Chain A
Amino acid sequence: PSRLPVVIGGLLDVDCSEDVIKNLILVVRGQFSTDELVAEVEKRNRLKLLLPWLEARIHEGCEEPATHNALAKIYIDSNNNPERFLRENPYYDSRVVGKYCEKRDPHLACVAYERGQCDLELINVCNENSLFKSLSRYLVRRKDPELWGSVLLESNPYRRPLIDQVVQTA
């Protein structure tokens, strides 16, 4: 059943029902790829199809980023606020959620980078378009002189607003 996601992509090119797939995912798998069925269904744009199986899979308690990141991605498209699932799930990876939540919601991507300590990506996004107060809260929290050195050297054009904010956040 390694070819399940490929033939399933072909199936959804045939445009068949979803409950068939929901039932066939619950078959006892064997050797299987998990972090690319998500890429497959991303083209098909039916990630809600994968909720119940992955729900049971995490109920077992698998510490796989391939699943723990997809749960977050579908939680994002839920139109809900998955900020606390993002903060209290010490299994996924900050990078994929950050690049994914770059344009859709940087307010969550910054928290992803915060716990993931992705400071460079934090400045690579939050400095560009965000409330720089959260940044200053992170740096003063995550006290790191090298970070200030990387930021405070007059290369970055966006230094004046973040200092004009951290004067108050301190």
Chain B
Amino acid sequence: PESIRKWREEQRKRLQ
């Protein structure tokens, strides 16, 4: 499902 879409925002949320 274009997991990169969820993954970019999830990683940024996690780090922020």
A–B touch (CB < 8 A): the answer is no
Chain B contacts to A: CB under 8 angstroms? none
Chain A contacts to B: CB under 8 angstroms? none
